[PDB]
Structure formats: structure tokens, C-alpha cells
Write a protein that binds this ligand. Structure first.
Ligand SMILES: CCNC(=O)c1cc2c(N[C@H](c3ccnc(N)c3)C(C)C)ncnc2[nH]1
Length: 168
């Protein structure tokens, strides 16, 4: 149903909220929820762990079947699979892990995948243990994504930092 509420409008197509992406998916019933994935779709930590646990492991079982038959994703790439109980579809997107020296230019490739979907619920890419500067990740989203993206950032201090920087 895509019923998003409580978001700040940053640009004509980019919105942000201090919220847990799992609770937003349960409330909003989005067509697409984005997962902050890794190349072998191992959903143990970060946003991926939160989304997988909220599907009671159904996302990991489906992801393992996909990897067995198709192999790993590329950094910057993506894959649409079921959204299970959280959304119609899950778009698994791999941003670069700059803590491991992956190419930060591939963060633009990662966000470019969102342009195939009219509206998405998403986390900020390459944050957490991937180590990209979060203000830079929001700027790449704003400059690359043309479709409607609703960003859920589940940390008040990071949300306030992002909003303050954007409004400068
Ligand atoms: C209680 C169950 N829910 C959660 O644990 C949870 C976590 C969470 C989240 N985390 C962000 C993140 C972590 C890793 N990689 C990223 N690309 C981003 C950080 C930057 C705040 N962002 C959005 N919603 C979220 N929900």
C-alpha cells in the first residue's frame, strides 16, 4: 500500500525518518524494501540481520537457494527476491565495504539500482560495518536516485547529523 508517514522531505523524491526499517515495513506494507546486503547474501548482521530475523529466517533460506544456483552478486549490484511478510519484494543491494578497501565509486552503482522501482523503503547504504561516510552516502542517494525513496535511519544522532548537514 506504500502508506509512508512521518518523513522529512529532503528533495522532491528523497525522504528520511528516524525509524527502524523493520517497523516501517510492517506499518507501510511497501512494494519494495531494500536490504543492505553482501555479495554471498549472508544476512547475519546490520540491517540484513534485522530484516532476516523479522522474516523468521525465510529471507536467508531463499537467499541460499538463489546463491546455490546463481553465485554471488557483484559489489554495486543487486537482486530482486521475495519480500516475505515485510514487502512484496526485497531488493538486495551491495554497497562497497570501504573498511575493506572496496571502491567507494561503486556506492553510486549501488543506488542506481533503485531507479528500476517507482517507490522504495530503504536504509542508508554502506553504513554500519561497511564504514562509508554517512553524509557522503546520503549525497550519492540524492544525486543518483530519481524514483521515490523513503530512508529509514535507526539512530537518532546519525539522523540529526544527516538532516543538519543536508540543510546547510
Ligand atoms: C531492532 C531491529 N532493527 C534493527 O536492528 C535495525 C537496524 C537499522 C538500521 N541500521 C543502519 C545500518 C546498519 C548497517 N548497514 C547499513 N547500511 C545501515 C545504521 C547506520 C543506523 N537502519 C535502519 N533500520 C534499522 N533497523
Amino acid at each position: 500500500v506504500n502508506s509512508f508517514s512521518g518523513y522529512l522531505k529532503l528533495t522532491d523524491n528523497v525522504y528520511i525518518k528516524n525509524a527502524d526499517i523493520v517497523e516501517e515495513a510492517k506499518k507501510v506494507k511497501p512494494t519494495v524494501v531494500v536490504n543492505a546486503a553482501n555479495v554471498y547474501l549472508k544476512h547475519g548482521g546490520g540491517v540484513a540481520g534485522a530484516l532476516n530475523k523479522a522474516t523468521n529466517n525465510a529471507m536467508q533460506v531463499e537467499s541460499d537457494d538463489y546463491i546455490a544456483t546463481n553465485g554471488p552478486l557483484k559489489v554495486g549490484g543487486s537482486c530482486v527476491l521475495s519480500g516475505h511478510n515485510l514487502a512484496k519484494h526485497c531488493l538486495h543491494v551491495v554497497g562497497p565495504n570501504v573498511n575493506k578497501g572496496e571502491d567507494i565509486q561503486l556506492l553510486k552503482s549501488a543506488y542506481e539500482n533503485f531507479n528500476q522501482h517507482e517507490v522504495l523503503l530503504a536504509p542508508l547504504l554502506s553504513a554500519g560495518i561497511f564504514g562509508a561516510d554517512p553524509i557522503h552516502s546520503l549525497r550519492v542517494c540524492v544525486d543518483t536516485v530519481r524514483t521515490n525513496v523513503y530512508l529509514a535511519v535507526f539512530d537518532k544522532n546519525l539522523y540529526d547529523k544527516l538532516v543538519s548537514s543536508f540543510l546547510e
